[PDB]
Structure formats: C-alpha cells, structure tokens
Paper text:
[name] and [name] are the enzymes responsible for the in vivo glucosylation of SA in [name]. In [name], glucose is transferred to the hydroxyl of SA, creating a glucoside; in [name], glucose is transferred to the carboxylate group of SA to create a glucose ester. [name] and SA interact primarily with residues in the C- and N-terminal domain, respectively.
We crystalized UGT74F2T15S and UGT74F2T15A in complex with [name] and SA or [name] and 2-BA. The [name] and SA complex structure of this mutant is very similar to that of the wild-type enzyme, with an overall RMSD of 1.4 Å2. In contrast to the wild type enzyme, the omit map for SA in the binding pocket of UGT74F2T15S does not have clear electron density for the 2-hydroxyl of SA, despite the higher resolution of the latter structure. Therefore, we propose that SA binds to [name] primarily in the conformation described for the [name]/SA complex (i.e. carboxyl group of SA interacting with His 18 and Thr 15) but binds to [name] primarily in the conformation modeled on the basis of 2-BA in the 2-BA/[name] complexes of [name] wild-type or [name] (i.e. SA hydroxyl interacting with His 18 and SA carboxyl interacting with Thr 365). Therefore, impairing the recognition of SA carboxyl group in each enzyme decreases the product specificity.
Author numbering: 5 to 446
Write the structure that this text describes.
Amino acid sequence: RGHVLAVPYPSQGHITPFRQFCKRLHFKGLKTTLALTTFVFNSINPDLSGPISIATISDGYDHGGFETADSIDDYLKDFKTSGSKTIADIIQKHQTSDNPITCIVYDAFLPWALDVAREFGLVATPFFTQPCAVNYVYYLSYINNGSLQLPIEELPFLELQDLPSFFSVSGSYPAYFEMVLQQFINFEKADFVLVNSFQELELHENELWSKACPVLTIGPTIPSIYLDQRIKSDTGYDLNLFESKDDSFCINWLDTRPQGSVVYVAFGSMAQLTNVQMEELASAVSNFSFLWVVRSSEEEKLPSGFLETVNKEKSLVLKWSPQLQVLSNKAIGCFLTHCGWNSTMEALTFGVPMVAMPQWTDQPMNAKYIQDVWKAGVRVKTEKESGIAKREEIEFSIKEVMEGERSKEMKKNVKKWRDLAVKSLNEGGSTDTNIDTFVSRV
Ligand SMILES: O=c1ccn([C@@H]2O[C@H](COP(=O)(O)OP(=O)(O)O)[C@@H](O)[C@H]2O)c(=O)[nH]1
Ligand SMILES: *[C@@H]1O[C@H](CO)[C@@H](O)[C@H](O[C@@H]2O[C@H](CO)[C@@H](O)[C@H](O)[C@H]2O)[C@H]1O
Ligand SMILES: *[C@@H]1O[C@H](CO)[C@@H](O)[C@H](O)[C@H]1O
Ligand SMILES: O=C(O)c1ccccc1O
C-alpha cells in the first residue's frame, strides 16, 4: 500500500521520463500521483495511453509559465518557494485518504523537494533525467566546489569540448549551472538515486558513480510497446506540451519514401538556433530528402521564402513530430539531433545513426558518447570563431552517416541497443531488478 508523488521539472524532456516511469510503477502495483505545475497542466492536450492521476502545484507562474519570469534565477527561486508549499498541500490533503503519500520521487533539479519529504516523514528519491556520465561529471565538480579538473582520472578520454556547455562556454547560464551542481547538495540524505539510463549503456560510468551513491538505473523510459511489451497500455508518450498536428500526415508521408532515404532533423523542445545557423541548416538539409521539425516560435528564423521552395515530393517541415513513430519508421536514414538525452536514447534503441549537433547543457557529452563510445553517429564540425556549423560541414556529416564506409559499420553498431534495452526491461534484467528494489522499499 504505497503512494508515490512524482515531481518532474516542468519541461517536456523531464515530464516524459517521469510519466513513463510512473507507468512502470503502476504496472508493478504502486499507485502514483504526478505533480504538474498549473501552467503545464493547462498546456497539455489529454489523449491518455493509460491510467493517470495528476495533482497541480505552482511554480509561481501559473498564467504565463517560464516566459513571464524576469530571469532564470528568479524562476528557480520562486519555484522553490511556491513549489515547496504546494507540494506540501498535496501530502497534507492526502494524509486522511485511502492511500496517503508515502514517497516523493522528485527531479534532481529540485533538491528542495527532499526537504518537504523529510518534513512529512516520507521516503525521498531524486530522479536524474540525464545519463550517468553527465551526472558523474557534475558530482565531481560539486565535491570539489564548482570546478572540474581535466583530465578526469577515471574517464581520461574526455576533453573540454566534450563537457557540458557550462564548462566550455565560460560564464554561460550561471543559474542553470548552479542548478545542475546543486543536484548533489543533499543526495547524501536521499534513500535512492534514480537515473533514466540502463546499465549496459554506460557500464563504466554507472559503476563509477555507484561507488559514491546508491544509484538505480531504471531506464530507458521508452514506451513498453517498442521494447519489452510487458505493459500493454504503454503505446506512446501521452503528456505532450506541443500540439501533435494530428500525427497521421507525417507517418503516412514517410511510408511512401524508400528505406533509409529520409534525414530526420529535430532539436528537442527548447533549443533555439540563430538566423545564421538556420540558414546553414536549411541549405545543408536541402541536398537531401528530409523531415525537419521547426517549432512554431522558430519559424521566424528560416530564410524568407524557404517553406515554399521546399520540394514537397522529397521533403516536409513540421511544427512538432510524433518522434517515436518517426524514429521507428524505416524511411529514416539518419537523425540530425541536438543530442538531448531522450532523443539520443530513442535514436539508440531504434537503431537510427545520428549526426550529433549539440547546442548546450549536457548535449556535448551525449555527442561525444554518440560518436566515440557507442560509435552510433558523428559530431558535426563547428567553426570556432562562431560556434556555428557551416552548411558544408553539416552536409559532410550527413553523407558520412548516410553513405560512407563507416556508415555501414555505424548501422550495425547501433542495432545492438534494442535487444539490450529489451533485456534490461524484461524479468531479471538490470532495470527491471532496480525497479523492484525501489518498489520494495516504498
Ligand atoms: O518534434 C519533436 C521533437 C522532440 N519530441 C520529443 O520531445 C522529447 C525531447 O526530449 P530531449 O531530452 O531529446 O530534449 P529537450 O527537449 O529536453 O532539449 C523527446 O522525448 C522527443 O521524442 C517529439 O515528440 N517531437
Ligand atoms: C530554461 O531556460 C530556457 C531559456 O534559456 C527556457 O526556454 C526554458 O523553458 C522551457 O521552455 C520550453 C519551451 O521551449 C517549455 O516547454 C518548458 O516548460 C520551459 O521550462 C527553461 O526551463
Ligand atoms: C540557451 O542557449 C542555447 C544556445 O547556447 C539555446 O539553444 C537555448 O534555446 C537557450 O535556452
Ligand atoms: O529541460 C532540460 O532538458 C534542461 C537540461 C539542462 C539544463 C536545463 C534544462 O531546462
């Protein structure tokens, strides 16, 4: 008779793994309530794929969300204040109910949630939505104090341009940098540490980070239908902040294309590219058959007249994609990606080789593992005066994944991950066992 209150950070790349993890807990017999901010809750269009219980909380920006904050530091500060009160509201209200909350799974970005869980005598477990290698680097910085020493002794192959953007773009995003460092301020006092990865994907880094902490890999959070198929209702991502266009057009359009012919291009839910970068992309893209996601707020930055000179026989532009169905479609030749962790793990488990074009935060690390560890893609060369990828380098990287000699080797190397993820989610696998360890304790 346990009840987990799950609290993601209010963004798509964090709500999705949290929701998928709750579906796994429901399948194991554990009730969950998902705590969403009021702005996010009123932004979702509910087409559910499974049972869901949602409580709303506040970050202090119910009306406008993050865009109405004065600054990133004010947003996180108000969210700790408002979010701590409204999380406590849910726990207190449920204390006289059939199933009082017994545990808080909270986003590692929000370590103040452990203070609330302690105040009510609850089990507390941070949930890291980024891979073990990224988190371990941040842990090493924190136990120093905000500084990392290259080379990292137990990971000597990493260079400065492989690190999270906060290290290589000096002074960038100081409040977000303090946030990722402060994920470890009280993890000492946490019962477990949960991570959206699976052990066979980063054995070395999972082993290293586990010496410091009790870490439980519980991923990948990809819907059950694509992998182990143990959860029959888990057919897709069902908490979308972005309207889905009514997905059939894009997937009908992909079915007409020859196998491996389409270059899929997407940058996640919040990355913003410059006009100069959009033009180098739009030029490089146009030498190929492509499916490119440009979010509605980014359409301004494409060259004027572009969305009409597209060749509609071979190519298509969307505001948002059904990315899971896109990546499982065999018209896809390769994935030009910003290397957000969900998109990386989705590309890996589906066997789609990548052109890595990291933009910031943990993306450079994922780009490095994509190219040099998993050997499932190549990283675009960026010119150093700008940080920008020129169209000729973007085109070279696409062709290297689409057709070169290492292209054939990268396709077989990435096809191994599906069965390893499936094995991990099935009975007796590392993730399935780690979920049972967590459920037993709760
Ligand atoms: O057009 C799109 C682009 C992204 N995604 C989903 O949005 C999530 C993006 O998370 P990620 O960690 O890759 O990037 P972030 O948005 O956090 O930068 C992923 O689950 C993708 O499958 C989608 O459904 N349609
Ligand atoms: C972190 O700061 C960045 C700006 O540097 C914000 O864009 C980001 O806000 C996210 O933006 C998404 C839309 O692009 C929303 O889906 C998400 O809820 C919101 O958190 C900040 O988190
Ligand atoms: C932070 O800056 C990056 C570029 O470095 C951009 O991709 C994001 O949109 C912004 O939040
Ligand atoms: O939403 C994310 O994926 C994210 C990742 C790193 C830093 C800040 C963020 O909002």
